[PDB]
Design a protein around this ligand. Structure first.
Ligand SMILES: Nc1ncnc2c1ncn2[C@@H]1O[C@H](COP(=O)(O)OP(=O)(O)NP(=O)(O)O)[C@@H](O)[C@H]1O
Ligand SMILES: Nc1ncnc2c1ncn2[C@@H]1O[C@H](COP(=O)(O)OP(=O)(O)NP(=O)(O)O)[C@@H](O)[C@H]1O
Ligand SMILES: Nc1ncnc2c1ncn2[C@@H]1O[C@H](COP(=O)(O)OS(=O)(=O)O)[C@@H](O)[C@H]1O
Ligand SMILES: Nc1ncnc2c1ncn2[C@@H]1O[C@H](COP(=O)(O)OS(=O)(=O)O)[C@@H](O)[C@H]1O
Ligand SMILES: [Mg+2]
Ligand SMILES: [Mg+2]
Lengths: 191, 191
């Protein structure tokens, strides 16, 4: 069709992209995604969050947490994120996405530069002390099998664009500011 | 997150929705989708087309044309369309989507009013005379098994919002005008 990605970007005055937020359960991915969305919205930029929990109740309602289903979960989210980026949207994906090979495949779906991998670099011990949903304790007690960071591996990014949360008391707002500053400098916040 | 669908709609000055375009192969779904997108873009509205062929090369690259895979194809497209609508986008889905039960399930995913079913009411004989890709002839010759309208059923909508193409020489532009007029009157082209 005659309407191109650059036409949609011209309309929105921004560049479509994927902000891929990965990290252990409890590392603060969703909290960061919200803070970022709020901040970008106030600057007049259009974002949309694909959160692992949300998507697992709709598009991915058929997927379990077996390793193969985690890969399919990530794969589908990567493809949908690509569609949002093509629509000119700043798409924020917030999924544990534990496997390096699967996150890398999502990156390869996109043109160089359009995929910003954001690592919530928060150690297991801190996530487990947070344990907002009580999942780690259920996992430790064997009620949840194959839980990421306990009985299934989490593979951190080797070369991500942004690493967050390493240090203490860095607030979700300050972290979103760092992401927004990065996007602004890279030119994603204007056509 | 604090940013709501109504906030995104306020930013874009339009209402998110799904325009579900269904019909036989060759009925002119993609041609209509493009014309519509072009017309809405010129009015400053943001649309995005989910075309069956396109999506089958990415998100749905794992699906065949067996009946169960057509249902899954439609199901996933409905879920993605819902996400686009929630982002405030006018999402145009252009898929054969032959099964009534599966299109109806996509409709039920959305709030009343947010799903506009558009039937390309073009008889098999006309689609087959067009046969732009030579698919009908391959189907007739047994090279393609289970082809919609030949060896697999197409179930027309019983109560769609818009029916197009019934009559001769109605142009894609005139048809898009009818859809745009409908969207405009229903209030989808303003926040
Ligand atoms: N920057 C932060 N500093 C301190 N606490 C935080 C921070 N961000 C999030 N939290 C808290 O840590 C808990 C988990 O955050 P959350 O954003 O839900 O994690 P997640 O990575 O989205 N979890 P999951 O959905 O299971 O993968 C929440 O209760 C937050 O309040
Ligand atoms: N309104 C129209 N009037 C006359 N011819 C048309 C019209 N719309 C489309 N066509 C032609 O019919 C052919 C098929 O149109 P197309 O939009 O590709 O069909 P479709 O429903 O998208 N096919 P498919 O992708 O296999 O499901 C094209 O070559 C068009 O040129
Ligand atoms: N075995 C598990 N491992 C990790 N998260 C789980 C598990 N079981 C349920 N969950 C829940 O599902 C959410 C994670 O889903 P995803 O982000 O979609 O995971 S992913 O690995 O497939 O990317 C977590 O919030 C967690 O609450
Ligand atoms: N057996 C088939 N029936 C219909 N379309 C087919 C078939 N095999 C290949 N195709 C192609 O795939 C396209 C249709 O895909 P979809 O729109 O995604 O179909 S759907 O039934 O699953 O909704 C058509 O353009 C057609 O070219
Ligand atoms: Mg979360
Ligand atoms: Mg088509």
């Amino acid at each position: 069709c005659s309407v191109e990605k650059v036409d949609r970007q011209r309309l929105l005055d921004q560049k479509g992209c994927v902000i891929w937020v990965t990290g252990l359960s409890g590392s603060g991915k969703s909290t960061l995604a919200c803070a970022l969305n709020q901040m970008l919205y106030q600057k007049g930029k259009l974002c949309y969050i694909l959160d692992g929990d949300n998507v697992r109740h709709g598009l991915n309602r058929d997927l379990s947490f077996k390793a193969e289903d985690r890969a399919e979960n990530i794969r589908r989210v990567g493809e949908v994120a690509k569609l949002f980026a093509d629509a000119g949207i700043i798409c924020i994906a917030s999924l544990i996405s534990p496997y390096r090979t699967d996150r890398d495949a999502c990156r390869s779906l996109l043109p160089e530069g359009d995929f910003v991998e954001v690592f919530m670099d928060v150690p297991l011990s801190v996530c487990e002390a947070r344990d907002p949903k009580g999942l780690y304790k259920l996992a430790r007690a064997g009620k949840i099998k194959g839980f990421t960071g306990i009985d299934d591996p989490y593979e951190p990014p080797l070369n991500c664009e942004i690493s967050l949360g390493r240090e203490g008391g860095t607030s979700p707002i300050e972290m979103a500011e760092k992401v927004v500053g990065y996007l602004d400098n890279k030119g994603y916040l204007q056509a």
